[PDB]
Design a protein around this ligand. Structure first.
Ligand SMILES: Nc1ncnc2c1ncn2[C@@H]1O[C@H](COP(=O)(O)CP(=O)(O)OP(=O)(O)O)[C@@H](O)[C@H]1O
Ligand SMILES: [Mg+2]
Ligand SMILES: [Zn+2]
Ligand SMILES: [Zn+2]
Ligand SMILES: [Zn+2]
Lengths: 49, 114, 43, 264, 133, 196, 160, 102, 86, 559, 139, 65
RNA sequence: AUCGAGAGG
């Protein structure tokens, strides 16, 4: 019934929790703060695959 | 860990008499009996049979805690009637009814064919 | 054991609330309550 | 017959008895089934020493299993409580010693039934210690299973006890209990959706009492008089003796009070 | 220690006010057109039919622990088939030369309205009630 | 706990003869309070007793899969076919007295889970035990047989009562009391200590 | 808005009136306006009321808002408790708030001050200005483990 | 002494109103012995009701506001704990300012 | 600095003993009682030092005085026998 | 903040808690192993020494024992292992660290501590199980629930310290609360559910039950009450025997909206001198309320009789409820078939209202309400439109619930329940809300990919027509779960934010105490108030009473 | 064979999904059933496999979670990870720091159809206790 | 992990019936409801002891040592 | 002893 998917370091079964991040290399638009001098921004986070 | 030994529900401990008797304060011919190592088996049967006596005024029991197997029974009777005797008549009446039951059951069982 | 293998951590703008886009991808309810609730999700 | 409570037996069997109490105060009916459950004494295993345990199960697991085994206690009155005897640990008038040993010689699953218990004590000619077997094939209680290369070697001391101390000394399984079939004394308030009579089904005991007339008022001064009971025994004591020794255990409790009063 | 009141009433209204063993009763004194009565009745003990006539009484007696009938040696103070005991909690001055009395028989309530019983039903714990056939 | 957030510790263990019983002699293994139901609205817990009751009698499995055309009415039609009251109610008798219960009890099997929290793993007591070296206060945690935290939040509450000596007692005799010497010219802890 | 007003006979009766609910606030120039009662106008911005109507008028404005959150939930708290908190913020002539720089910059003893927030920095400048803490506060004696002047500790005990 | 008269002014208003001469004799029917006892009880029971010196009224006050706030959990205005966080951390940037005009 | 007290006349503090001086008094008595100090009431079989001090207080036989300090530095001594207990 | 203003302490304990109906209010159920571990220094004296020698003779193995003896020299004697544990000559002035024993003062506490009512003194009652037993009616001030909660306990080490618990911090003293000038403890959830069942005019008690019920009151004077009902059968109302718990001299007056002196529905409460006259008992009478029974008895009789009052009511009503019995089934959520048909009609009736008003906004025929968007005006209507449907369906069900409905009975006594729970469980759970608004278009112009775009219908926006009994659809479940997640975030946020708020208030007003003259001052002495509360009273000894001069005509005033 | 597709969260936006295969089809109706909102679409691209799959492993264990309040299902999903049961069949072989195994585990009488793929019937974590809802004592 | 000896609620012994219960399902091709009824488990509290039972012992036997 | 995680109410 063991399903696997873990590592055995120093005899202790370790799991890698799936990590969540905002996707890269996509363009998004943000209405910035009303007290902010800039009123809008278009951000893309650039990183190579 | 902290639980008591489960034989304390019927085994009398050190210096624990089965019956302790004490007079009711501010009450005439009223006495209370501290039954030890006993549950609702005895209290309900004594009380419901005492109530059938017509010279007894009060009869009621209570388990002051379901932790401990013990209950208090208090009786009040007419003047010239010690509740010990009222208790004894009830008990003897119980055993006679029980003994009468036992013989009638054996008669009906031995009649029954299986 | 099964639930630990289908588990998600999210570091650190309203993430903790169950999102519409989570339909069918994340369990709506299976998430640790109290502190840091909604960041940690189960598939 | 005798004046007082009456008994009319409806049905009976080896392990089931069905009867009607008549002219009984209710408290006696309840007090009877309380002692009939958990105060009539009976012998069952209360100690175990395990020489070798190669099984999947743990020893305390196996020990608890042995406790609930049904052992004969017909002549249990002739046996004595271990706490009462004068022996060092357990004599032959207080304890019955069983042995049990089985090995997985077969190249298949080898079970350990209750018939495999063997008595290693001087019985002194009393019907005591024979493990109850109602299983049709005669095996009885399936205690444990063995592979090949597994064995179990243990010794069981069976002592005498009351079901209040542990449910393994329970002499009877389940007592059926219903005193008013039509609720003519109104001791329960019925929960109804449309019609109390149509939702709640007629009890089987309704056939053995008089159906009421709603045109007649409620009998205030009436009390519960006729009771419908059914006792089931696991087998350690036959059904007739379950109730009878239960009745007698009640007398012994009452007389101890009567005796204690004489001491005061 | 004798009777404090006697009259005959014919019931006008009976209702199960969200109760199953108790009804509220509404009657007026017969051979009298200014004295009426409200009372709570345990219907299961005494079924009260509509348009019935019932003799009603109140006594000051007939503290100390209530003992059972005791073989009936102590004779009842009632040839009646229904009895209650309670306490007057207030007497109401509806008008001059008019009075109404409130009784509570362990939560069962009574309201007796009339004029004549001015020198009766003092503020006292004792309030017995009788009802005949 | 059940499978519906119905947490709860044991308050008492009753023997079977003290336990209330149905007319068929069946006894409850466990008793939940009815007041836990309304505020939490755990109706699935209520339905589980109903379906599980029919499943044991019928000898078939109980389908509690979500988003199905499974109705309480359809279940009640089945349960009343098997002689029990359609809505799970059952006449019950008091165990101590045998007198019928005025209220018919909702009775049935329900899957319950023994949770990982046992009491003897949590019991902890201490009276002047081990101490940390730097703080001179009791060590942290029951695993090392340490002391409980008399926190600032609790310190406020003792101030609310006005128990000045108790508050000092928890803060001096209960832990890390100490005796220091001070100079009258420079009010610092730099006195040469030659006590004897 | 519903309103109870004294009827000419004397008893109070429902006397409805129109009321203008606003979004946004600049009090200084709305009370100096015709057609309104400048004796009854009110803001949920107590800080403006403190600026315009004096500090003591801001006190009742402070309470009424504190009251409003409690009663909106349905709860009751006695007057003395909120009023104690209110007067503590008010007593210093301004709106001394309950925060690390609102109240915790008072002339109270440093040990009293160092136990809330900005711990080390309070003791730094306390060592810099050489302030003499009188140890008359509760926290000073809680630090020192002495019987603080608290109830039981407010007095001495002597003999005849 | 004026602080005393100011501090009891509301209570005496209740006292005079309920112990009015017409009210005592027509509604209470108090006798001389009964009336003096009511006067006796009020004096002591009032004197019992006076607060006790040394009571840490601030910590009690702060806690007395604290517990109900902890219970707070849920016609458009800032309400509840967010509003309470404003009032305490006196907010220049009030989220929902409003002006009730009469 | 010194003798900043007030005589019995012009004493302004409460005559009624607060619960905070009572509990300090009852505790201070039960403390010294616990250490075998003399008892000045004919005890009716009571053996609890706190129970003693309570009944020892009702007879007003406690030779202690309460120094009630005032925020200026002044103070009013109040004997336990003249202090009221409600 | 963590080692000087609060620290670890010796003589402390912690254990899972549970409640005992056969236990007094001020007591605490302390396990033996806790009583074996905790100790109190008791200096020997001629009147205690006969007890102390036996205690040392018992030893720490079994309780009541002792663990240490302190000679006058200073060295400690260990009773667990020592050669002279059997023979000891207790000189006067020696100290004996005896076991914690029955009826000793201990500080009982539950974190989080936001209260003086969260650290109250208790009477030690050693019990044979490893759970902290406490009285069932001391839950509210601690906010304790027996769902796994643990509590703490502290033990004083000096006589003055013991006194401060018994004389200032005792449970009977805090029964009346300066916060909210009302009691903080009441009869809850079984005694409350049962005392309503008991007090019904239909409830009658036969003789056998009365005598047991009568004996269960610890302070019963042996006076059998004259039965409310005579000759046909000697019967007692529930009101009859229940009044035996109420001491003489208690007077209660209450009318509620349907109440004469005659009370055809038995509403209101009238109690005269330890006896009740009419009215069902419920939460208003016996709960933590201003004009409640607890406020009266604590004020006139005192804390001791009020503390005893709790147990006496509990022991009687728990007894009657034990033999009467009470349950709650699932048939208690079902309403009439005809009621259900009206329920779904009420939902669809509001559905057409939503569709029609939507059509009004679609044709730009909607008058824009002042100060808000046409869309805001549209949302505002449909939100109110559906809430009325949810509320009307609930009251349409609450009408159908008969008197026997156990869910209604818990609500009627106020034990645990509200009207909204009935609506959602039986008629319609209602409309979900996120951030104050309906479910937003997380997907592009739609809430879920099973809806066409620009769907503003009740279903698309997060309205749940079905009830919990009826069962939610797949989409309804995700919307309902979407709303629930905010509740968990809000709960984690409110608990987090409030803990900060409470600490800030406490550290701001920590020095404020009423000085000897009633000048409210700080450490320095800055006058916060010149009279505490401007009158100088203690909030506990304060009750809400009407001043009849304020209202009323000038004419009625004069007469 | 092209009978099932892999749909991303972003690709979801461009498609229309059907809850049930009874939604592609053309009075007397059982009153006790839930109120299915009649589908108001035709341009369906996909149909859901079964709506039950929106839940995780622990939430699948909950019986009738559709009839339950939303927070409660979150609470249980955290407690099912604390419920003692047989975690592995090789519990005697391994030497874990802590192990807790139920004596006689039994499969629930009410089972989700999604349990069979969790092997919960084969590896339960509780017992079908006989439960009464009543106020017997005050315990 | 093996057939319980007796019902926790009734107390009636049930260990003898497991082997017979399985033969009724397979050899006789019966259903589970009538199988429990044939064995004499007339109360439902007994029935859930055997119907819900999972005999994990067979998995434990597969381990070699 | 420092950090880290998961859980308790
Ligand atoms: N007016 C009310 N008074 C008292 N209890 C209530 C109540 N309304 C609901 N409750 C009960 O209190 C419970 C609140 O518990 P939960 O919402 O699960 C978090 P909690 O257990 O209260 O943690 P906490 O005590 O630290 O705040 C509700 O489930 C309900 O049973
Ligand atoms: Mg809790
Ligand atoms: Zn022997
Ligand atoms: Zn120096
Ligand atoms: Zn069974």
């Amino acid at each position: 019934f063991d399903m696997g998917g873990y590592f055995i370091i120093n005899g202790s079964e370790k799991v890698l929790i799936a990590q969540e991040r905002s996707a890269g290399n996509i363009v998004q638009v943000f209405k910035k703060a009303a007290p902010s001098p800039i009123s809008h921004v278009a951000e893309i986070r650039s990183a190579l695959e | 860990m902290n639980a008591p030994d489960r034989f304390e529900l019927f085994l009398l401990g050190e210096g624990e008499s089965k019956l302790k008797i004490d007079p009711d304060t501010k009450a005439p011919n009223a006495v209370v009996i501290t039954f030890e190592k006993e549950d609702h088996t005895l209290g309900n049967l004594i009380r419901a049979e005492l109530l059938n006596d017509r010279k007894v005024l009060f009869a009621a029991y209570k388990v002051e805690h379901p932790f401990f197997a013990r209950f208090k029974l208090r009786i009040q009777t007419t003047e010239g009637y010690d509740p010990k005797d009222a208790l004894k008549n009830a008990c003897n009446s119980i055993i006679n009814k029980l003994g009468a039951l036992k013989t009638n059951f054996e008669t009906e069982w031995n009649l029954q064919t299986l | 054991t099964l639930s630990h293998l289908r588990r998600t951590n999210t570091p650190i703008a309203k993430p903790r609330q169950l999102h519409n886009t989570h339909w069918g991808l994340v369990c709506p309810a299976e998430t640790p309550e109290g502190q840091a609730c909604g960041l940690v999700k189960n598939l | 017959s005798e004046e007082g409570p009456q008994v009319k037996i409806r049905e009976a069997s080896k392990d089931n008895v069905d009867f009607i109490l008549s002219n009984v105060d209710l408290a006696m009916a309840n007090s009877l089934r309380r002692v009939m459950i958990a105060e009539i004494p009976t012998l069952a295993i209360d100690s175990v020493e395990v020489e070798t345990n190669t099984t999947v199960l743990a020893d305390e697991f196996i020990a608890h299993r042995l406790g609930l085994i049904p052992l004969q206690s017909m002549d249990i009155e002739q046996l004595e409580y271990s706490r009462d005897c004068f022996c060092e640990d357990h004599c032959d008038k207080c304890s019955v010693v069983l042995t049990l040993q089985a090995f997985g010689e077969s190249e298949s699953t080898t079970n350990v039934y209750s018939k495999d218990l063997v008595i290693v004590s001087n019985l002194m000619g009393r019907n005591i210690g024979h493990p109850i077997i109602q299983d049709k094939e005669g095996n009885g209680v399936l205690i444990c299973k063995l592979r090949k290369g597994q064995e179990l070697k243990l010794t069981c001391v069976a002592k005498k006890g009351i079901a209040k101390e542990h449910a393994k000394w329970g002499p009877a399984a389940a007592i059926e209990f219903e005193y008013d079939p039509w609720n003519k004394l109104k001791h329960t308030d019925y929960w109804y959706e449309q019609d109390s009579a149509k939702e709640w089904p007629q009890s089987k005991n309704c056939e053995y009492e008089d159906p009421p007339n709603e045109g007649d008022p409620f009998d205030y001064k009436a009390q519960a008089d006729t009771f419908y009971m059914n006792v089931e025994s696991v087998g350690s004591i036959p059904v007739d003796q379950v109730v009878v020794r239960g009745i007698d255990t009640l007398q012994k409790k009452v007389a101890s009070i009567l005796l204690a009063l004489t001491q005061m | 220690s004798n009777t404090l009141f006697d009259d005959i009433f014919q019931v006008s209204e009976v209702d199960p006010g969200r109760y199953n063993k108790v009804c509220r009763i509404e009657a007026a004194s017969t051979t009298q057109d200014q004295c009426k009565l409200t009372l709570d009745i345990n219907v299961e003990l005494f079924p009260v039919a509509a348009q019935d006539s019932l003799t009603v009484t109140i006594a000051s007696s007939l503290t100390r622990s209530w003992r059972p009938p005791q073989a009936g040696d102590r004779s009842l103070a009632d040839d009646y088939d229904y009895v209650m005991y309670g306490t007057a909690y207030k007497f109401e001055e509806v008008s001059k030369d008019l009075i109404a009395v409130y009784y509570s028989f362990g939560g069962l309530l009574m309201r007796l309205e009339g004029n004549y019983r001015n020198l009766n039903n003092l503020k006292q714990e004792n309030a017995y009630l009788l009802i005949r056939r | 706990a059940s499978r519906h957030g119905q947490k709860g510790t044991i308050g008492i263990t009753y023997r079977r003869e003290d336990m209330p019983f149905t007319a068929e002699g069946i006894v409850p293994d466990l008793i939940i309070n009815p007041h836990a139901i309304p505020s939490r609205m755990t109706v699935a817990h209520l339905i589980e007793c109903l379906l599980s009751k029919v499943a044991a009698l019928s000898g078939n499995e109980g389908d509690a899969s979500p988003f199905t055309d499974i109705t309480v009415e359809g279940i009640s039609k089945l349960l009343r076919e098997h002689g029990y009251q359609s809505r799970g109610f059952e006449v019950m008798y008091n165990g101590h007295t045998g007198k019928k219960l005025m209220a018919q009890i909702f009775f049935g099997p329900t899957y319950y889970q023994r949770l990982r929290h046992m009491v003897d793993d949590k019991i902890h007591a201490r009276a002047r035990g081990p101490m940390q070296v730097l703080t001179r206060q009791p060590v942290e945690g029951r695993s090392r047989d340490g002391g409980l935290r008399f926190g600032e939040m609790e310190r406020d509450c003792m101030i609310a009562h006005g128990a000045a000596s108790f508050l000092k007692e928890r803060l001096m005799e209960a832990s890390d009391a100490f005796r220091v010497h001070i100079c009258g010219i420079c009010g610092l802890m730099t006195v040469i200590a030659k006590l004897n | 808005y519903d309103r109870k007003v004294p009827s000419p006979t004397g008893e109070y009766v429902k006397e409805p009136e129109w009321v203008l609910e606003t979004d946004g606030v600049n009090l200084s120039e709305v009370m100096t306006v015709p057609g309104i009662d400048p004796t009854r106008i009110y803001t949920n911005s107590f800080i403006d009321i403190m600026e315009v109507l004096g500090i003591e008028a801001g006190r009742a404005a402070l309470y009424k808002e504190v009251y409003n959150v409690i009663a909106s939930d349905g709860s009751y708290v006695n007057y003395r408790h909120m009023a104690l908190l209110v007067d503590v913020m008010t007593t210093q002539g301004g709106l001394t708030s309950v925060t690390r720089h609102g109240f915790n910059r008072s002339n109270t003893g440093a040990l009293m001050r160092c136990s809330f927030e900005e711990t080390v920095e309070i003791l730094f400048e306390a060592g810099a200005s050489a302030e003499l803490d009188d140890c008359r506060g509760v926290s000073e004696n809680v630090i020192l483990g002495q019987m603080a002047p608290i109830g039981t500790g407010a007095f001495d005990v002597m003999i005849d | 002494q004026n602080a005393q008269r100011d501090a009891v002014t509301l209570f005496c208003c209740l006292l005079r109103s309920r112990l009015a001469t017409r009210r005592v004799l027509q509604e209470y029917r108090l006798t001389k012995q009964a009336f003096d006892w009511v006067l006796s009880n009020i004096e002591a029971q009032f004197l019992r009701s006076v607060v006790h010196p040394g009571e840490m009224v601030g910590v009690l006050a702060a806690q007395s506001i604290g517990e109900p706030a902890t219970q707070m959990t849920l016609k458009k205005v800032t309400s509840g704990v967010p509003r309470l966080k404003e009032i305490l951390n006196v907010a220049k940037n009030m989220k929902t300012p409003s002006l009730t005009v009469y | 600095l010194k003798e900043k007290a007030i005589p019995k006349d012009q004493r302004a503090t409460t005559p009624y003993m607060t619960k905070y001086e009572r509990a300090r008094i009852l505790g201070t008595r039960a403390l010294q009682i616990s250490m075998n100090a003399p008892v000045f009431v004919d005890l009716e079989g009571e053996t609890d030092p706190l129970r003693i001090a309570m009944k020892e207080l009702a007879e007003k036989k406690i030779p202690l005085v309460i120094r009630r300090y005032l925020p200026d530095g002044s103070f009013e001594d109040w004997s336990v026998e003249e202090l009221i207990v409600d | 903040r963590g080692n000087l203003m609060g620290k670890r302490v010796d003589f402390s304990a912690r254990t899972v808690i549970s409640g005992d109906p056969n236990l007094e209010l001020d007591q605490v159920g302390v396990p033996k192993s806790i009583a074996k571990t905790l100790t109190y220094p008791e200096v020997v004296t001629p009147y205690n020494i006969d007890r102390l020698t036996q205690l040392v003779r018992n030893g720490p193995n079994e309780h009541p024992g002792a663990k240490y003896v302190i000679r006058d020299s200073g060295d400690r004697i260990d009773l667990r292992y020592s050669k002279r544990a059997g023979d000891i000559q207790l000189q006067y002035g020696w100290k004996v660290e005896r076991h914690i024993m029955d009826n000793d003062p201990v500080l009982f506490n539950r974190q989080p501590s936001l209260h003086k009512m969260s650290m109250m003194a208790h009477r030690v009652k050693v019990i044979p199980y490893s759970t902290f037993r406490l009285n069932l009616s001391v839950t509210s001030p601690y906010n304790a629930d027996f769902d796994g909660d643990e509590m703490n306990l502290h033990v004083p080490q000096s006589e003055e310290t013991r006194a401060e618990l018994s004389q200032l911090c005792a449970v009977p003293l805090q029964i009346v609360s300066p916060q909210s000038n009302k009691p903080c403890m009441g009869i809850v959830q079984d005694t409350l559910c049962g005392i309503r069942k008991l007090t019904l005019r239909d409830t009658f008690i036969e003789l056998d039950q009365v005598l047991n019920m009568l004996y269960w009151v610890p302070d019963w004077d042996g006076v059998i009450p004259t039965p409310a009902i005579i000759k046909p059968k000697p019967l007692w109302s529930g009101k009859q025997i229940l009044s035996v718990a109420i001491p003489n001299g208690i007077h209660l007056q209450r009318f509620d909206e349907g109440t004469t002196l005659l009370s055809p529905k038995d509403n209101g409460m009238l109690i005269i001198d330890g006896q009740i006259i009419f009215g069902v008992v419920e939460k208003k009478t016996v709960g933590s309320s201003n004009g409640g029974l607890i406020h009266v008895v604590t004020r006139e009789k005192g804390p001791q009789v009020c503390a005893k009052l709790f147990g006496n009511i509990q022991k009687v009503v728990n007894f009657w409820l034990l033999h009467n019995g009470f349950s709650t089934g699932i048939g208690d959520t079902i309403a009439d078939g005809p009621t259900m048909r009206e329920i779904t009609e009420t939902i669809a009736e509001a559905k057409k209202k939503v569709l029609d008003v939507t059509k009004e906004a679609q044709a730009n025929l909607l008058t824009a309400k002042h100060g808000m968007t046409l869309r805001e005006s549209f949302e505002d209507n449909v939100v109110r439109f559906l809430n009325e449907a949810r509320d009307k369906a609930g009251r349409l069900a609450e009408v159908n619930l008969k008197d026997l409905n156990n869910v209604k009975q818990m609500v009627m006594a106020g034990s645990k329940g509200s009207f909204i729970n009935i609506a959602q469980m039986s008629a319609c759970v209602g409309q979900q809300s996120v951030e104050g608004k309906r479910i937003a278009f997380g997907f592009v112009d739609r809430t879920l990919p099973h809806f066409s775009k620009d769907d503003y219908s009740p279903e698309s926006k997060g309205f749940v027509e079905n009830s919990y009994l009826r069962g939610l659809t797949p989409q309804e479940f995700f919307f309902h779960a979407m709303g629930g997640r905010e509740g968990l975030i809000d709960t984690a946020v409110k608990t987090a934010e409030t803990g900060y708020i409470q600490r800030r208030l406490v550290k701001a007003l920590e020095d404020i105490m009423v000085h000897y003259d009633n000048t409210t001052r700080n450490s320095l002495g800055n006058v916060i108030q010149f009279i505490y509360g401007e009158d100088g009273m203690d909030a506990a000894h304060i009750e809400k009473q009407s001043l009849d001069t304020i209202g009323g005509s000038d004419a009625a005033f004069e007469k | 064979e092209g009978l099932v597709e892999y749909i991303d969260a972003e690709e979801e936006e461009s498609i229309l999904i059907a809850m049930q295969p009874e939604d592609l089809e053309p009075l007397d109706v059982d009153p006790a059933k839930r109120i299915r909102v009649s589908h108001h679409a035709t341009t369906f691209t996909h149909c859901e496999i079964h709506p039950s799959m929106i839940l995780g492993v622990a939430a699948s264990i909950i019986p009738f979670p559709d009839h339950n309040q939303s927070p409660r299902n979150t609470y249980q999903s955290a407690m099912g990870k604390q419920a003692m049961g047989v975690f592995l069949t090789n519990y005697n072989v391994r030497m874990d720091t802590m192990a807790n195994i139920l004596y006689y585990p039994q499969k629930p009488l009410g089972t989700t159809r999604a349990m069979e793929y969790l092997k919960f019937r084969e590896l339960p974590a509780g017992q079908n206790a006989i439960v009464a809802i009543a106020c017997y004592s005050g315990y | 992990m093996i057939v319980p000896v007796r019902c926790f609620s009734c107390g009636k012994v049930v260990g003898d019936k497991w082997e017979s219960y399985l033969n009724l399902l397979q050899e006789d091709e019966l259903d589970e409801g009538t199988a429990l009824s044939r064995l004499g488990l007339k109360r439902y509290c007994c029935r859930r002891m055997i119907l819900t039972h999972v005999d994990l012992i067979e998995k434990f036997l597969r381990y070699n040592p």
